[PDB]
Amino acid sequence: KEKHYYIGIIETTWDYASDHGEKKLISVDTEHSNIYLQNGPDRIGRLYKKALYLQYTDETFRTTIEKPVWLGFLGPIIKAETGDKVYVHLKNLASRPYTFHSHGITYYKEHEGAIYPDNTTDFQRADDKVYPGEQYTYMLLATEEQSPGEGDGNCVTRIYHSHIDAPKDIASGLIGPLIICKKDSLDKEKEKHIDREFVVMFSVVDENFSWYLEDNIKTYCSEPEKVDKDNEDFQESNRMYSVNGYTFGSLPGLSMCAEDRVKWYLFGMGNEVDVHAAFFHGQALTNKNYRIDTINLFPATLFDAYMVAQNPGEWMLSCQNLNHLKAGLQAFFQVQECNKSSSKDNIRGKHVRHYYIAAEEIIWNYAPSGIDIFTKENLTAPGSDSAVFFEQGTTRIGGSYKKLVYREYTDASFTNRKERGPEEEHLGILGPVIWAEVGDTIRVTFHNKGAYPLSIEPIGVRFNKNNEGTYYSPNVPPSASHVAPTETFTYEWTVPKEVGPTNADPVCLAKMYYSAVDPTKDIFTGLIGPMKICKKGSLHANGRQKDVDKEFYLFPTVFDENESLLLEDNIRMFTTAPDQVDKEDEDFQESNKMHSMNGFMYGNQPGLTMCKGDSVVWYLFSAGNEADVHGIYFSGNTYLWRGERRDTANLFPQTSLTLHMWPDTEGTFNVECLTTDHYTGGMKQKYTVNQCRRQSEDSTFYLGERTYYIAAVEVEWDYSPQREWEKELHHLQEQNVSNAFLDKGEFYIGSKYKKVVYRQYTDSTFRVPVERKAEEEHLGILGPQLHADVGDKVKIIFKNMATRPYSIHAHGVQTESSTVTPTLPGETLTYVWKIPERSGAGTEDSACIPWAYYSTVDQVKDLYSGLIGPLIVCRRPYNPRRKLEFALLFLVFDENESWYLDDNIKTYSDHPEKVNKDDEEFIESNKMHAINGRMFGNLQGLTMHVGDEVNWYLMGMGNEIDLHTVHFHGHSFQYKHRGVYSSDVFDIFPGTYQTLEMFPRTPGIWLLHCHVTDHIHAGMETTYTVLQN
């Protein structure tokens, strides 16, 4: 059908915590809220003016249609079913220009609502700048191409926002939800067997970026003269950590019944600090028929989830990013009894597993050997990167910290202690494994031999209010939420089918438990452990999975000892001058950020050993804050996850993953974090795979043979050869702005740096480089796109025409040795990459998948210096439509880490003498936020036709900062085998390699960008062109 909405943009005053109390939130004392909510002489408080979308009954925009209270400031909910034509009648009643741009629906250029250089004419531009008092009516068509995929639910979450300066428009308040549904799955604007629909935007809503900042300062700050917009504390006080714009618990309206079938539409929004971990303390959810609880959201991440509300009472919805939790990213919801009126599991007291766990103080050395196992270098080597963390002296703790750690004892006295064996040598700091099967009951007798009160909070199991490990509320014998320094308490959790693995899940799921009297300090103090929840009849009496040789539990995180309950205690036991230590000095706190796996650093983790051919399950999980974006890479072997083949697992606060691996080659390999600073900081370990059988000789499995001649060449690389697109963008936006990254001013470098890049040659003489033709113009900085099929042996003849050692190696591929030999300058070496079945698609991948190739001599610096490329591995050779391929690398090139920094100062700075490599402004000037090493629409060659199929190969690498939410204007993509899932933003992080299918249908020049604020603004964007057929 054809549907009409009337949406006005008005200016209005918005309250971020409309009272009314009195609350206790997790990890938030009753005074902390003042930071953000307290009006003052130099602080705005909790009221702000902003621009919001409202719904109207009528073309005479006078009577509003009120929204549900839980929506907050979000625009009104728009819905559509496949086949529907939606007309959005916008009227702008604010003081400045805005638009309506919608994410998951098809439109011509007249109806995109976004301004940018696309060669359009006046009649396709009226949509892109709706002036005050002006009115524009947008035509949207819900096509099949944009429909939810066969593997999605009936409805998916999409958004709409203003898109002049989207970041600032959205910060100002113009963001709302657009729910797209299959036909005929809707009945009277609600989905057919769903009782409740809620939408929840998680975001650090940043009023510093609003168009109304100055109006707000002028209005509320009783001393406007004394405000410094760039003072860091003032900025914090305007960062409103919110769900739907509600802070500190004040989200009202989230009420439901026991039994109710609920659909949640979640999204993230904002900047680099918007690393969220949405958590329903409830409460168990499914996403895509998989059990989850936690969901991670980033700027523009679109997600949906299904919940049969159960376990009646007052619950918390929160962000488990500990920095967020403690700034109040928390909303209550309630499940009331109405009464039942259903039934089900039932199982309580039948199969009982009984654990006895104590909390106790130890001195944990994060690196017992005292050396870095990968380099054999002494950790305190003056000048080394490890020295920052392991140096000990007048104002510096070192490698070893007093911690609190869970440990297992034999029975209900605490006389004895279950000694750890070989199977648990790798656990390290982690507490004992809690394991249960669906249908079991779990009792945990917890005893506290520490000096602070503690608890145990499990993720992934069922527990009533009497057993909850955290305390919170909307309005001393020990309890679930509080076991004090000498006391003891026995928790009861259940594991019913509705909280355990579904048919689509694997046999066991990775979960975790931690103390949560204050989880923002307890975890880092050391109170974290692994859990494993499995299907009925899948484990042995001893806890081991039936047909599985090995099971490992990995918890990588940044152990922020600055947040440890034992910090002061540690300062007084380890520094040789305790009084001179400033607990606020940046350098000091870096020295206490311990980047580690199971509390181990610099290759010192023991006990990851296994036989070749072994069946191995890896249980990964993490915790922490925004710094915790991890890409755990298993060199030398791949794994399956949800039928996808990968070798690098992405993890965020409270993320957990179950990986299946069959290691296929003898050696000692690395398990390490790809994320640049984590690696440098010591997040790297070995795992050994031994030979325990024969030993055949050769299985003659070379269906295919290829050879490629590639060189590293030093080249002058320009991140922005032209500036016309940028000038036009900023002109269209009316922005007085200038460019930190590209403007030389007095002495900065600019857009051109000497780099080293891979390039293809025609033969072994290396004297004729291969012509890059039209369909490879888009590669930019990337090395050539190499192809291989499963079955192939790929010879890489590699010449180093550069001036220091380098190599070339690919993710995914199998080689004979775990070490990669460096190629010296002038040398040519041969590397052989075998492509067995495990180097290619899993059963649920598309036919072609991408893997990064890169140099291993110094993985951080060689990368930032320019050496990176895509290897595409395809399945099995065995109609009219043209198939295209594009590889895209989303990476912030950090020129401060290039081997060529010094040269680039001497060559490109007008006054090199005045450069200080350690100055924060110079540092920023060399962080080049690029796509394939080009910015601001300087990446050409993304050109295609209506009717084509396009495989996009998205790749991510880099640092903590390198979260990238890749978004294509005008079109959606599908992914997975047979295009089963569907969306228009894909999350990309370091180590994330994904293939997306696109079937372009709408002619136009369309914007392609990362949706993270700082990244758009720094030019991480280009356009792609769709031509008529």
Ligand SMILES: *[C@@H]1O[C@H](CO)[C@@H](O)[C@H](O)[C@H]1NC(C)=O
């Ligand atoms: C826009 O127009 C110019 C001038 O006609 C053309 O040469 C240029 O390639 C166009 N831009 C794109 C992205 O197609």
Ligand SMILES: *[C@@H]1O[C@H](CO)[C@@H](O)[C@H](O)[C@H]1NC(C)=O
């Ligand atoms: C590292 O060097 C110091 C002296 O510079 C020495 O005392 C220490 O034992 C060394 N560590 C190891 C593990 O060899």
Ligand SMILES: [Ca+2]
């Ligand atoms: Ca337009």
Ligand SMILES: [Cu+2]
């Ligand atoms: Cu958007």
Ligand SMILES: [Cu+2]
């Ligand atoms: Cu968050």
Ligand SMILES: [Cu+2]
């Ligand atoms: Cu990491």
Ligand SMILES: [Cu+2]
């Ligand atoms: Cu980005």
Ligand SMILES: [Cu+2]
């Ligand atoms: Cu868009």
Ligand SMILES: [Cu+2]
């Ligand atoms: Cu956009």
Ligand code: NA
């Ligand atoms: Na404030």
Ligand SMILES: [O]
């Ligand atoms: O979009």
